[PDB]
C-alpha cells in the first residue's frame, strides 16, 4: 500500500513513533499504521469523560445544567476557562465544553469526579465495547507519557472505532450525540494538527492532546462535502522526555491519508 509506505517514511523523517487509524464509513474500510500499539492519550482522553457524562444525562435529564463549584484548590496547571470562574460555578455542560474546546484540565478533573474517579471513565469505555482504553490518573499526571507505561493509553484502532460509535453511531442518545458533535466541531486547539493537512472545504471536529516525550495527538471526525464521513486518529510520541511538540507530523499524516 502506497499510503503505508509514505506513512512509514514520514515516521522515519520525524524520529518518533507514529500511530494512525482511519475509518472510511463509505465501505468501512480501515487504514492502520501501528494500529495496535499503545500510545499515551493525553488530552484526547477528555472525549471519553465528556461522553460518559452525556451518557449519564440520558436518564438524569437535567444533569448538564447542574452547577459545580470551582475553588482555588481545584486549579491545576492549565485552566484557561475554569480560571474565569474561580469562586463561582460552572454547569456540567460548561465544563464539558471547556474540557473539549479549550482542553481545560480543571474541567477534566471535575468530569472525572462526577464519574466517581478514573475507573468510572474506564467503565464507560467498556460499556460501549472498548476493551483497550484505560484511564488511570487525573490531570495533570496522566500526561507523563513514559515509554512503555500502560497507564492512560489506548491504541489507534480502538480509539477510531470508539470515536465512530460516539459521533456517528448510536452509543449515545440522539440529543447527546448531536451535542458531542457540536462541541467537537467547535474545538479551538486544532488548527495546526489534522485540520491543517485537509482541504479547507471539509468540516472537522477534533480533540488534540499533548504531553511529555513530545507527545502530540489529534482525533477527528471529518465530513467531506458530498462524501461519507471519515474518522481519523493520529498519535505521535518521541524518545526524549523534553522533546518539542510536532503538530506538523499530524498535519502531514492527514495529508497523506487525504491524498488516498
Residue numbers in the entry: 27 to 57, 59 to 238, 240 to 288
Kindly provide excerpts from the paper associated with this entry.
Serial crystallography at conventional synchrotron light sources (SSX) offers the possibility to routinely collect data at room temperature using micrometre-sized crystals of biological macromolecules. We show here the versatility of this setup and methodology by performing structural studies at room temperature (RT) of three additional enzyme systems of biological relevance: (i) Klebsiella pneumoniae CTX-M-14 β-lactamase, a β-lactamase relevant to multi-antibiotic resistance mechanisms; (ii) Nectria haematococca xylanase GH11, a highly active xylanase suitable for industrial applications; and (iii) Aspergillus flavus urate oxidase (UOX) in the presence of the long-lived intermediate-like 5-per­oxy-9-methyl-isourate (5PMUA).
CTX-M-14 belongs to the extended spectrum β-lactamases (ESBLs) that play an important role in emerging multi-antibiotic resistance mechanisms. We then looked at the first 5000 frames collected in the first run. At 25 Hz (maximum frame rate of the PILATUS 6M) this corresponds to a data collection time of 200 s. From these 5000 images, 5109 crystals could be indexed with CrystFEL and data collection statistics show that with these 5109 indexed crystals, a full dataset to about 1.55 Å resolution can be obtained. This means that less than 3.5 min of data collection time is needed to obtain a full serial crystallography dataset to near-atomic resolution using monochromatic X-rays at a synchrotron. For these 5109 indexed crystals, a total of no more than 34 µg of protein in roughly 3.3 µl of microcrystalline suspension was used. This corresponds to only 6.65 ng of protein consumed per indexable detector frame. In comparison, 6250 ng per detector frame was used in the first SSX experiment and 89 ng per detector frame for the lysozyme mix-and-diffuse study, a drastic reduction in sample consumption. Again, the refinement statistics and the resulting electron density maps are of excellent quality. The datasets collected here allowed us to determine the first non-cryogenic structure of inhibitor-free CTX-M-14. Like in the EuXFEL structure, two N-terminal residues that could be built in the cryogenic structure (E25 and T26) could not be built in all three RT-SSX structures due to the absence of interpretable electron density.
